[model samples]
Target: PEHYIKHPLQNRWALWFFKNDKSKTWQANLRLISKFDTVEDFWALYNHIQLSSNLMPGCDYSLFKDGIEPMWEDEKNKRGGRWLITLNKQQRRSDLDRFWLETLLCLIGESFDDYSDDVCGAVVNVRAKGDKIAIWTTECENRDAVTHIGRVYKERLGLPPKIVIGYQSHADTATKNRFVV
Candidate 1:
């Protein structure tokens, strides 16, 4: 028999899917797709799903660490915030899947160094107006960590030098100050 080797990721993660169904409660609309701990498993799951660009508007896909709910209510997420990136409709074709793939690779590969521990997960919101991708972290105020993650993340996307992405705390998300992002 032939042997196959599997690469282990530092964390076991769960993938969740959200469909905006008006009849269901917010929590009810969110579903766990699967959990994976190996690189091959991640690839299997990724290849099996509909790409983010193909999901209907208002649908979302979240990949978070095992045991953590993809919401603010999670004890591990309450104090954290996310670094968000907004994409215009045109970029959907050019970058959606590639960017998201990088997002997942970074999380599973712990590409952020010590700061990677601060990462909780990432979310992709597919919308008609514009799509958004965010990396959730446990310490939004940890300037060193958040900045490090953000800088590395931006560079990973191969974005232009002038393009800047900012980190916002969860508290700042409410009241729509929008944190002036």
Candidate 2:
């Protein structure tokens, strides 16, 4: 008898990497790594990639729905916002990699239920000051959906209730200071 295989995810996801190069345009620094649509394939890709904590400073990893560029300018993300989780420098040694993996699992598993449709993608920024993980959703005006998604996401990340995460609209996150939910 043939061995059984895990089924594929409903949607394909594309992975992107960004390296800050002052000489290049911001858009030029972002590059597509690959795409996967199955549980096994996701693992295969995940295992082969370097952990977020291991990335050099000013680097980033972004996973978005296939065909959607991982950028604020992407049509799918233009009016959307993100649920941001900021981690201190120490967390890079303690929690960065694990948290990033969990975020990826949540995305691939469609852990958001009906609200999953609103999820655009997730981004992990490895910065010198600290690291940031964010879940970008398709709309800023869908407060209920966005809030629910944020609540569920927070739970999935196993964050303590005392550790409050914030949601920021892309317009706001892009323009002024990093706004909170």
Candidate 3:
């Protein structure tokens, strides 16, 4: 008899790395590592990469849909926004790695239900000032979907109800708006 294996995810995701170099353009720094569509493959890649907390300051890790580049200009991302989770310096040792891992699981596991289709990717910025994580979606105009995603994401990450995360439209982020929720 042949063994039955679990099926892969509906969509393939690409993992990207960005290291800021003064001499290089921002776009040049972004590079795709691999694409995977299975839970097994996602875990394999996650286990192989360094934890988000271990990345050098000014670096970033982005997990996006297979054909979508992890950038504001990507067609899938241009009108989108992200639910931002800002962590203090201390949380780097305690919450950073776990939060990032949970975020990845959410993406690969399709945790957002009907709204999952709205999700484009996620990004983690390792910065000296403080670390930041954001879940990007395909459309900012879908208030119901976007808000549901944010609420579910916060719950899954085990964040305290008192600590509020905010959503920033790509247009706002690009145009120098710093509104916080």
Candidate 4:
């Protein structure tokens, strides 16, 4: 008999992996790792996977609402934007995994309260120059929800007051505008 129970999450999430491979298209290199809707399952998946810091450069890990593809081209993400935190190359060793974990906890934990509904997902890029973490929200124009999410996200990460983060819409390059928090 089993007595342990799984605590369900408000939203089911899918984890995606992208390895920058020249041998194939971007979509081909990206694949779903798993989907989890409970706190225990989330931890199971997380513990079995490699840490973001250990991922090869040029690879990425994205956690999005189930059914929402991790690309900007996805219908739900088309008008979305991201609150980005850029960490220098040096911080990759010290902060990347922890920050990414914090970001994931924020999403599944619904740290934004009422504004959590505005969030779509989060992504972490393992790059050579620097590593980047971004929380994607459904609307770039919903200033109240977007900024509230930004403030809550920043506080949850316990970032320094002097450090600022920027939100960038997935709009066309020519017309893209920036929002900072």
Best by TM-score: 4
lDDT of each: 0.89, 0.89, 0.90, 0.92
lDDT of 3 by residue, 60-85 (tens): 99999898999999999999999998
Model 2, residue 120: C-alpha shift (Å): 0.5
Model 2: per-residue lDDT, tens digit, 123-167? 999999989999999898888889889989889889988878888
Clashing pairs for model 4 are: none
How do all models score by TM-score? 0.93, 0.94, 0.94, 0.95
Candidate 3 — which residues are off by over 4 angstroms? 1-6, 176-181
Question: Model 4, poorest ten-residue lDDT window?
Answer: 172-181
Q: How many clashing residue pairs appear in each of the predictions shown?
A: 0, 0, 0, 0
Cα shift from native, residue 135, model 4 (Å): 0.2
- Cα misplacement distance, residue 96 of candidate 4 (Å): 0.5
Better of 2 and 3 by lDDT: 3
